[PDB]
Design a protein around this ligand. Structure first.
Ligand SMILES: [Hg+2]
Ligand SMILES: [Hg+2]
Ligand SMILES: [Hg+2]
Length: 447
């Protein structure tokens, strides 16, 4: 039985469009995912987040569920489309009211609210104007952040600017398998830069408008890249993918410069002239901790998410697989954490996302048994604890997710929740893993 450090944060995570529902209620306007999901062939079975888990109406019950599970923190995203419809103009108070009430309820329960400003639900109007490949979007994101800070700053002390910008830029504009569904390598690289810029401008605005004790951060899905063989070519491959998956963001955000090799690898695609003088300094803002998302490692040797790395080829990492068919490999998380500790020694780490999808089902007696999810989480928590033992500064872990929800292009076909959701009724059924995880969050001990 392993014991986690004094003060370790135990929470769960969700995203606005994935759980909220009420897509066309109280002033909210369509985001890129609303458009993308209603587009034939884009999302499995034509599923949309119109209703999702109906969290917008069941928010009270969900917070109470968090309390019963003894969670200390709740990571959620703010729907830009609700707070500032269209991505420009004045704030919509009714939109902000939903989060005021939510945050207030969390606090009343002794649960620390952690808000992510941007979790992919870009207002469609900003996409109509160019989306992330267009510079103005970054400036608009900063204004939105100031609006959010100004309204919720007194109740929410932990903030995250962006969640997994890699997926947003490369899957959204590179391979187009995510909203808005575009496919252009340069567009994807411009999007990456503008996400870097937006993040910076946002942290600047957060720093400026929030109390002096608030915590600002960014959530990155750090790809842990490994080579198929020892070949020297496979090592070059690892470098290319690491630069595209991680350093294109950690470079500017944490070091104030794009890695030279990345610039070199993409020289055939672009000259990065859209990186205006001073953009890198703006993207490089002081953070209180880095949010890390991890699920599985990467094994390597006009329409892809890796512009400039066509010479490379990916492989299925070894290990059992989840419903997503992603390899289960706790070691990937341990190595990943050590890498980060080595590269950014002074940067406290928080696992803002980790979990697994399995084909759960509610039996005739009303129970949902997910022993496989219990194993996955336990195994990854052990890797985390091990990383901590060896020196890594990890301060928290957020299980993805509290509720089964709209898993983007996969629709509702993938269940990641600690709590099962009967979609037609919206009924929540805590799974066996919820009961097990509750014990870990109450004792701080991992059996
Ligand atoms: Hg992704
Ligand atoms: Hg801050
Ligand atoms: Hg990826």
């Amino acid at each position: 039985a392993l014991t986690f450090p004094e003060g370790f944060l135990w929470g769960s995570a969700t995203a606005s469009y994935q759980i909220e529902g009420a897509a066309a209620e109280d002033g909210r306007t369509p985001s890129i995912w609303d458009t993308y999901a209603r587009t034939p062939g884009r999302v499995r079975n034509g599923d949309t987040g119109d209703v999702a888990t109906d969290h917008y109406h069941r928010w009270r019950e969900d917070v109470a569920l968090m309390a019963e599970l003894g969670l200390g923190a709740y990571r959620f995203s703010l729907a830009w489309p609700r707070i500032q419809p269209t991505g420009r103009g004045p704030a919509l108070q009714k939109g902000l009211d939903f989060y005021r009430r939510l945050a207030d309820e969390l606090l009343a329960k002794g649960i620390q609210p952690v808000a992510t400003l941007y979790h992919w639900d870009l207002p469609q109007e900003l996409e109509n104007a160019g989306g992330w490949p267009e510079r103005a979007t970054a400036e608009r994101f900063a204004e939105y952040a100031a609006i959010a800070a100004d309204a919720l700053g007194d109740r929410v002390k932990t903030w995250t600017t962006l969640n997994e910008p890699w997926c947003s830029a490369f899957l959204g504009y590179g391979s187009g398998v995510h909203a808005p569904g575009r496919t252009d390598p340069v567009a994807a690289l411009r999007a990456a830069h503008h996400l870097n810029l937006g993040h910076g401008l946002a942290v600047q605005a957060l720093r400026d408008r929030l109390p002096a004790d608030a915590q600002c951060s960014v959530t990155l899905n750090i790809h842990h890249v490994r080579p198929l063989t020892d070949s020297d070519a496979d090592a070059d491959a690892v470098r290319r993918i690491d630069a595209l998956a991680n350093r294109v963001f950690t470079g500017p955000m944490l070091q104030g410069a794009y890695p030279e090799d990345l610039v070199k690898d993409t020289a055939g695609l672009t000259d990065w002239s859209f990186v205006r003088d001073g953009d890198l300094r703006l993207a490089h803002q002081k953070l209180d901790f880095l949010g890390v998302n991890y699920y599985s490692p990467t094994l390597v040797s006009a329409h892809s998410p890796w512009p400039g790395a066509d010479r490379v080829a990916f492989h299925q990492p070894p290990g059992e697989t989840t419903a997503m068919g992603w390899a289960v490999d706790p070691s990937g998380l341990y190595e990943l954490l050590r890498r980060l500790s080595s590269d950014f020694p002074a940067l406290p780490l928080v696992i803002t996302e980790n979990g697994a999808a399995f084909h759960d089902y509610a039996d005739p007696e009303g129970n949902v048994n997910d022993p496989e999810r219990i194993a996955y989480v336990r195994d990854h928590l052990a890797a985390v604890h091990r990383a901590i033992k060896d020196g890594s500064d990890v301060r928290g872990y957020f299980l993805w997710s509290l509720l089964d929800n709209f898993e983007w292009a996969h629709g509702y076909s993938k269940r990641f929740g600690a709590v099962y959701v009967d979609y037609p009724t919206g009924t929540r059924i805590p799974k066996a893993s919820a009961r097990w995880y509750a014990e870990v969050a109450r004792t701080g001990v991992l059996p």
